[PDB]
């Protein structure tokens, strides 16, 4: 049930029943951590961190190996993102379509898509304000959005 | 309709159903060990890889991402794990 799409897809990940690390995995809980630290220093998002470990190093779930999530581990070391990843990507998309809308005055659909994107931004901003992740004075402005990201 | 036991499904039934519509969810993917030519060091590669995997020793292109299962290079040898 997508918010702006009538169709309801079912494509998603299915976690296995077992939570124990496989025997063939030769990496330790400590050794995974600096790999996360090294890749984060390179400038990769935490969602991208898991994909690299999954594809190449055979780490199916970092939470099962180290006992902590990627964001929690990075927060402890101090490599914390300034803004939440999900909110940051939507702001980046809003800037890109807004820049495109300057040079195409007749693009009606681009105007409509911008409404949907900013609606999702306000919904996540209100939720992120409640969890005290964002200060209770942060606002999304079109001119400020370029400087934000 | 045909009579099926919801508690005890048949061997061909559970492997045929969708991964989310089974009694207990179970993925259809797996991990495999690949051996590239040029150097016979073993690399662990996910089946539905989304990035090109390079051998650590010799930097040879192992697999190319596709829509579904990743396609392996010619001459490579692979084995399912676990």
């Amino acid at each position: 049930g997508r918010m702006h799409a009538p169709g309801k897809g079912l494509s998603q990940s299915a976690l296995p029943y077992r939570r124990s690390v496989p025997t063939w995995l030769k990496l330790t809980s400590d050794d995974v951590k600096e790999q996360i630290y090294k890749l984060a220093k390179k400038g990769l998002t935490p969602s991208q961190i898991g994909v690299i470990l999954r594809d190449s190093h055979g780490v199916a779930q970092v939470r099962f190996v180290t006992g902590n999530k990627i964001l929690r581990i990075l927060k402890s070391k101090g490599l914390a993102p300034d803004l939440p990843e999900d909110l940051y990507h939507l702001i980046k998309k809003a800037v890109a379509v807004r820049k495109h809308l300057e040079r195409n005055r007749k693009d009606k659909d681009a105007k409509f898509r911008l409404i949907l994107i900013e609606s999702r931004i306000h919904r996540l901003a209100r939720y992120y304000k409640t969890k005290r992740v964002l200060p209770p004075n942060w606002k999304y402005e079109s001119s400020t959005a370029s400087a934000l990201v | 309709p045909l009579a099926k036991d919801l508690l005890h499904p048949s061997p061909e039934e559970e492997k045929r159903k969708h991964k989310k519509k089974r009694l207990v969810q179970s993925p259809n993917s797996y991990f495999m060990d690949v051996k590239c030519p040029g150097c016979y060091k073993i690399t662990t590669v996910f089946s539905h890889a989304q990035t090109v995997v390079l051998c650590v020793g010799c930097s040879t292109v192992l697999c190319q991402p596709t829509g579904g299962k990743a396609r392996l290079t010619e001459g490579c040898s692979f084995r399912r794990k676990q």
């Binding site: 390179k42 998002t45 300034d82 | -």
Partner: peptide, 27 residues
């Protein structure tokens, strides 16, 4: 195949995502 990844390195390698990426940039 290697060339196609290198074109995608610009999008997937960010320069202002983390908080540390701002503070060492301000120096």
């Amino acid at each position: 195949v290697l060339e196609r990844e290198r074109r995608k390195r610009s999008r997937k390698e960010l320069l202002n995502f983390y908080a540390w990426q701002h503070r060492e940039s301000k120096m």
